[PDB]
Design a protein around this ligand. Structure first.
Ligand SMILES: *[C@@H]1O[C@H](CO)[C@@H](O[C@@H]2O[C@H](CO)[C@@H](O)[C@H](O)[C@H]2NC(C)=O)[C@H](O)[C@H]1NC(C)=O
Ligand SMILES: *[C@@H]1O[C@H](CO)[C@@H](O[C@@H]2O[C@H](CO)[C@@H](O)[C@H](O)[C@H]2NC(C)=O)[C@H](O)[C@H]1NC(C)=O
Ligand SMILES: *[C@@H]1O[C@H](CO)[C@@H](O[C@@H]2O[C@H](CO)[C@@H](O)[C@H](O)[C@H]2NC(C)=O)[C@H](O)[C@H]1NC(C)=O
Ligand SMILES: *[C@@H]1O[C@H](CO)[C@@H](O[C@@H]2O[C@H](CO)[C@@H](O)[C@H](O)[C@H]2NC(C)=O)[C@H](O)[C@H]1NC(C)=O
Ligand SMILES: *[C@@H]1O[C@H](CO)[C@@H](O[C@@H]2O[C@H](CO)[C@@H](O)[C@H](O)[C@H]2NC(C)=O)[C@H](O)[C@H]1NC(C)=O
Ligand SMILES: *[C@@H]1O[C@H](CO)[C@@H](O[C@@H]2O[C@H](CO)[C@@H](O)[C@H](O)[C@H]2NC(C)=O)[C@H](O)[C@H]1NC(C)=O
Ligand SMILES: *[C@@H]1O[C@H](CO)[C@@H](O[C@@H]2O[C@H](CO)[C@@H](O)[C@H](O)[C@H]2NC(C)=O)[C@H](O)[C@H]1NC(C)=O
Ligand SMILES: *[C@@H]1O[C@H](CO)[C@@H](O[C@@H]2O[C@H](CO)[C@@H](O)[C@H](O)[C@H]2NC(C)=O)[C@H](O)[C@H]1NC(C)=O
Ligand SMILES: *[C@@H]1O[C@H](CO)[C@@H](O[C@@H]2O[C@H](CO)[C@@H](O)[C@H](O)[C@H]2NC(C)=O)[C@H](O)[C@H]1NC(C)=O
Ligand SMILES: *[C@@H]1O[C@H](CO)[C@@H](O[C@@H]2O[C@H](CO)[C@@H](O)[C@H](O)[C@H]2NC(C)=O)[C@H](O)[C@H]1NC(C)=O
Ligand SMILES: *[C@@H]1O[C@H](CO)[C@@H](O)[C@H](O)[C@H]1NC(C)=O
Ligand SMILES: *[C@@H]1O[C@H](CO)[C@@H](O)[C@H](O)[C@H]1NC(C)=O
Ligand SMILES: *[C@@H]1O[C@H](CO)[C@@H](O)[C@H](O)[C@H]1NC(C)=O
Ligand SMILES: *[C@@H]1O[C@H](CO)[C@@H](O)[C@H](O)[C@H]1NC(C)=O
Ligand SMILES: *[C@@H]1O[C@H](CO)[C@@H](O)[C@H](O)[C@H]1NC(C)=O
Lengths: 334, 328, 334, 335, 325
């Protein structure tokens, strides 16, 4: 019979999945995992979940699937169905849906007993997505692979590659998209909330930052244009109907702009972005100034002049704060 | 042969899944259970369901999976596939969808026959959600685990931990989110719809309250500002065009505010919050005042409508104080 | 050996599923059934479907799963996996999707052979859902259970309980919700698609009615407010500018109310509700009234009689609307 | 042992599913099929797919599942699990989802070897749903059942009932709905992806037509009402601000009408409905007439009067064409 | 026993799925594949996923499933369940969902050992869609098939048909739809995630373009009508009520046009559609009303409007030109 067929028979007719493959039960099975991010398919700041398509590969030593290549025509490694052998139950804690990814029927066995398992994960995980810096926003999400049942005495987890490689690896990442990732940071720890159970878990912090240009052109530049134009409402003659008409029309322009803002901004219930805070503050200041003009026009002057200067100074202060905040947010993002 | 392999063969060679594991059929199988809420993924007040991600673990005594460690290299406990042993039919009654949780292949067996089963559940359950206090909600609805088929003299349920410990347990809860849970309250009862049969069930009341600050900033403060502006608007005489122009400005503000609210205020079919009632009442008063001004430009109507407006704002104000008081 | 273990072996090592469990093939298997409605999750008038959560239980006599208790330590009842025995193919015809229900691994067996099977069903079924009486809706559609393949000479269906007990059963219904059920009505008939075969089917009519209060407050009362406002307005002089102003302002308000209704009224294409038709009619009648004043004021005996005719016609329409509301409530209350 | 049990053991003990049940491999397996449409659950003119709940039943001769009734207590037929026997891979083309139908565990076997398989299919398939005639629209969507792998040398398809009996079959159709079906027309043909292989397929053309009354009431009557109001508006003099205000309010009525209609007028990208074209052309005519009126007001006249009458005539002609196209669409929809 | 039954018995009694079917393990298994696009079911730019329903067929030589026809009643070909034999793990990369593909129980075997597997794939894949030219879009989305686990030393991929034939093949495409595909371009390369290992993969570039006529009728012509009317309205004086009435007329026109737009115009965060910005810009500019200063700001505004419309026209011509060729 051919080498592959009789080798597979030799291995799997004696093998019995369902028992951790160690001939000394005190020895833990060390699962060396690795993660390569392929694409951040989706990021719901509304639902506080994100969908990451990651190529996940892990290997472990199976002490029963060993053979001498000299007896089997120099076969160094062979592929066998994944469901035919014991597979560690490594699982990611913050999953929200098991995922719609395929099964990848096969795994590789090397004559040393090492089992290599490559599988794609279209995992969607709960995440603390915060849009406080909306346009210049950097999200720091994490994935935590942990042996769900087995304690560290049974299954331990480690990195396949050196940490420096996995941090900087962006070989196959789909760069085009709303998000670009700066790196995935591994971190090992012995999770434990129990009297005598310590579970090994491997955290990967996937750092991703939004690329703002579309939002810069859509929100920031028009908002800056409107805020700059609003300064002119304070150089037109103080109580003229011309000035009141100007302020009314620019308030209408701001109001219609905020509709586009509502359309464009991502929905959330955790916290409003600073951009929205400044927009609504400017709207309130403009309304107050317009009301002051309306009232003073009803009356009329000295009070009007001093109030006008006060409102102009507060408006200038607000717009300066907004611009400095934009610069600061950009500095944080880069 | 290695101890693990021959121990597994010894246990499972003659084992027969599908029979309740007791050597005296009169004894009930007591399934001790525990629940830890990991995250409240979604609360939907239109579909009246909420999705919670919970770490559910349970253990029971399987009287056939027993061995002396002396014969098996002092193997005190081992893991074997979950599908290879009898597993109790504990089910959550008010589930709406089975969920998308994984299968968790293995379970632990201790040499005394105790089987420990840990499994994550993304349960989606029906609940009597109400948004009467929308920004200051405190929802309170149950998860009840019961043996679906087996009566109490076949399967019985109990708590793994003391009730107070599970009640105060928030070790792993994912805090950052719209909902924070005040506690889960266990409660045991013998359900029955026909006297010949009694069923053991264990209710867990997950108590969660919305953290309002986002809606305080986004909804309450702009509405308060607009109400204050409309109140000040009445200092202009009705016979003055300034008043109608100012009213138009505030109606434009309310249009913008309503559009923003549409993106945020929850939809439902059972009833809107008091906040919505006050919103529409204030908008109606503003519109009626605009009609009054455009009609004038009956003078006592000015101060009458102003008093109604002042009354509404005060009612709106004390409602917020009351709702906040309940929220604490 | 323990009693349960050897009893289960004795039964299921000889037993073979697939074959209908009857030792005389000329005898049909009578499958008693029962249904308890747990909740009405979703009634969709756009898709013309509704989703109900029902606790469905059925029992039948299996003539091979019988034993003498004396031989098995007086075991008079035991549980065995549902997939280890013949399970009748009782299926629901109106189904549109099987649903998200679990599988309930086990069933009960009594020593005389009767098998008890309990299973929850998330049935979603096609139904003719008309909203003609929208606020005071009462719906009438049904669920029919029938052996999909087997004729009545193989499988016949029957009620577990007396018809009046299932009819009045509201022991577990989730009452808090948009819909309340008035009862479930069983009805047995021998369906026959082709003259050579007869099939047993058991129709359950799940009668439900909407609880209107939210829609009564949200739609009906504001609508009547607007309509009575128009009636009040008709008191103004015919050619007066006040009359035209009132008409046009009420047009704006009523149109925005129609927009609100569109936002709130359920979507459908099978048919418009009466409430909707009267709204549209009265709007059109108002537009005719408004259009009329433009000609008359532009150009008064003709105006006066024309105004009187319009006023009386609109008042008659208002009365018809109110009487329609009384009729709809009278039907829904009983 | 009981007759059923030993008969089942006699049949299925040595039965080897997977192999086509024919004892002379050269003979094809003729799979007779039938289809009864139960309900047209959803026609999606946006996505150009529809979902039809159809009761599908097929039978074929299995040469190995044969027995002599006298030897087994005179049993003429029995039911056995569907997964225990060879089942032809008759598959519908142009599907978009495998469907949400159950598994129907059992099939009937008759002693001659005929296997009967009844199964409900929640098929969702692609057809070119052209809504040109939207309110009075008749769609001719098709289902084709074909042995996905096996060529005609292995599996051949045929009708269970006479073609006219299936063409006029509405025995169990759920008629209360937006769509009513005029019939399903069978048509056999031998497809050939490459001339070396010939594939037998059975096309059923399900013909369905929208019942318009809802759309009549909600769209066409209000549209006629607004158009008649616009025709009335032309009586007012062009020089009058009354006419300008009337036209502005009528245009606002147009706007609100279309706003509400957006909920019900189907979305699509294959082509605009004819009624939509008339809507937009009347809207544009109204707008341009109003603009000309405003300009002539600015001037304020002979040319003004001539253009007023000309625009009135064009509007009247457009309304006449609208009536003609409505009656035409209705005439086609009747047949 | 009948020929088919005992032939299946001979083949499958000692056959054991799992082992790559070669009697000399050093030989790679060459999986010839072919792909025919049947329909482009969806192009979702908001999620950047494209859904195509494609007829996928592949064949390979299984060196264990061989027989002499003379011994088995001259049977040259037979069908056996797909689950009963080794099947290569040819996986399409950049999938998003495994998809609603049916199981297709059977495959053909020919006495020389060739296995033919036909299966329909409803692949939904993530690829870079863009609506920069919305009404005149042309998209270039890839499908790449690769043996997920096996390296090129185990599984190698090739085309069933000649590249030009598969490229120009549009025999079964559902042509009556929003999208028409120009062709599918195959391309073979040895992917390498590590220096020591090489993976064979086969990219098919599906090239599709939106057919615009609907959007020309629905969007472009009405928008040009409204823009031309806005230009015309400038001749009414800047202080006059005639201009106000004209502006309200135009505003109602835009009110209808924008709901029509919202019902059809796609939106995504990757970038803007050049056509889309003008609509909202012009609708917003009705706010503008910019006596000595006003009368000349009006001419400035008129120049702005005219240049905007000129840019719109040349943009439409450009978009059509890049879409035609
Ligand atoms: C579980 O695995 C971790 C990771 O491999 C082990 O931690 C390493 O221990 C070695 C000891 O020589 C150190 O050199 C490494 O620096 C450690 N790595 C990290 C990330 O801390 C851990 O010792 C293992 N524990 C058990 C019980 O097997
Ligand atoms: C994302 O979060 C991770 C984890 O908190 C940060 O990584 C830590 O950074 C600090 C400061 O440089 C170090 O002292 C820790 O050792 C890091 N942890 C690990 C596991 O490497 C990371 O800096 C954050 N990045 C961003 C952009 O927020
Ligand atoms: C089923 O389980 C319940 C819950 O543990 C048992 O109820 C307890 O019984 C013990 C008996 O010693 C009491 O001390 C506890 O106070 C009971 N707890 C509660 C919450 O009632 C019950 O006895 C078990 N058996 C049966 C037949 O119900
Ligand atoms: C949530 O609902 C539960 C169930 O009604 C409440 O728990 C009960 O509260 C009452 C009043 O304090 C006690 O008498 C009962 O003993 C409690 N039952 C249990 C099982 O603990 C709970 O107080 C509610 N919480 C909120 C915040 O509404
Ligand atoms: C729902 O439909 C059922 C079936 O038509 C109605 O029940 C029938 O009502 C008629 C008239 O009262 C009786 O003669 C039948 O005997 C009833 N059938 C059964 C099985 O009881 C029922 O009335 C409908 N619901 C409503 C609210 O009208
Ligand atoms: C199938 O089952 C139904 C329901 O049990 C049978 O109908 C009953 O027939 C008996 C005959 O005496 C009547 O007394 C009952 O009132 C009937 N019940 C109902 C609900 O109508 C029916 O006879 C059975 N048919 C066969 C062929 O066995
Ligand atoms: C495959 O089946 C079709 C349909 O039954 C066969 O076509 C019919 O064959 C009969 C007998 O020759 C003719 O009377 C009919 O006119 C044919 N057409 C139809 C529509 O019935 C066809 O011959 C079969 N082919 C094979 C190879 O079995
Ligand atoms: C739907 O399409 C079918 C298939 O083209 C039409 O049926 C054909 O009609 C022509 C009319 O000349 C006949 O010559 C063919 O013989 C018919 N074929 C079949 C299989 O019956 C049908 O008329 C169309 N119906 C509608 C309403 O469009
Ligand atoms: C794997 O398959 C590819 C084809 O997909 C082989 O490449 C071909 O090799 C032949 C050798 O004569 C050339 O004529 C073709 O031009 C090649 N095609 C391409 C697309 O490069 C390749 O040799 C096979 N084996 C390996 C190890 O890659
Ligand atoms: C779609 O992308 C493919 C791949 O880049 C293009 O096809 C290649 O184009 C280059 C440049 O003209 C040629 O050198 C190659 O021979 C082409 N084929 C392959 C397989 O690379 C194709 O032109 C693109 N189509 C569109 C419309 O952008
Ligand atoms: C394995 O291959 C080497 C040459 O590469 C050969 O010398 C050796 O004999 C082979 N093994 C056996 C068992 O023949
Ligand atoms: C098992 O444990 C007992 C108690 O500690 C000890 O005496 C014995 O030597 C152990 N046996 C083995 C094989 O470890
Ligand atoms: C079974 O129950 C009967 C009473 O019904 C009793 O007499 C008998 O002893 C019991 N048998 C056993 C083995 O307990
Ligand atoms: C077998 O059944 C047929 C049909 O019912 C009947 O005519 C025949 O007499 C029966 N024969 C025997 C031996 O039962
Ligand atoms: C077997 O079939 C082939 C098909 O071409 C034919 O040429 C050959 O003569 C046949 N041989 C026998 C023995 O039937």
């Amino acid at each position: 019979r051919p080498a592959l067929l009789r080798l597979s028979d030799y291995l799997l007719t004696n093998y019995r999945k369902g028992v951790r493959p160690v001939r000394d039960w005190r020895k833990p099975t060390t699962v060396s995992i690795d993660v390569i991010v392929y694409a951040i398919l989706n990021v719901d700041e509304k639902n506080q979940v994100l969908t990451t398509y990651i190529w996940y590969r892990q290997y472990w030593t199976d002490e029963f699937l060993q053979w001498n290549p000299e007896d089997f025509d120099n076969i160094t490694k062979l592929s066998i169905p994944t469901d035919s052998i014991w597979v560690p139950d490594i699982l990611i804690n913050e999953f929200v849906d098991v995922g719609k990814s395929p099964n990848i029927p096969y795994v590789y066995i090397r004559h040393q007993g090492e089992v290599q398992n490559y599988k794609p994960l279209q995992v969607v995980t709960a995440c603390s997505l915060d849009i406080y810096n909306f346009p210049f926003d950097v999200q720091n999400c994490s994935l935590t692979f942990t042996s769900w049942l087995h304690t560290i005495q049974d299954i331990n987890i480690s990195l396949w590659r050196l940490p420096e490689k996995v941090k900087s690896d962006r070989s196959v990442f789909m760069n085009q998209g709303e998000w670009e990732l700066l790196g995935v940071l591994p971190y090992f720890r012995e999770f434990s909330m129990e009297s005598s159970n310590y579970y090994a878990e491997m955290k990967f912090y996937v750092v991703i930052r939004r690329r703002p240009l579309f939002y810069v052109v859509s929100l920031l530049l028009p908002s800056i244009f409107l805020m700059v134009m609003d300064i002119v409402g304070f150089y037109l003659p103080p109580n003229s109907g011309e000035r009141v008409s100007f302020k009314i029309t620019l308030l209408l322009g701001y109001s219609v702009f905020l509709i586009i803002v509502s359309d464009t901004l991502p929905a959330t219930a955790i916290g409003t972005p600073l951009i929205g805070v400044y927009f609504v503050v400017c709207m309130a200041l403009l309304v107050i100034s317009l009301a002051e003009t309306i009232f003073i026009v009803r009356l009329v002057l000295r009070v009007g002049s001093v109030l006008d200067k006060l409102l102009f100074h507060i408006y200038l202060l607000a717009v300066l704060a907004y611009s400095i905040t934009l610069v600061m947010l950009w500095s944080i993002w880069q």
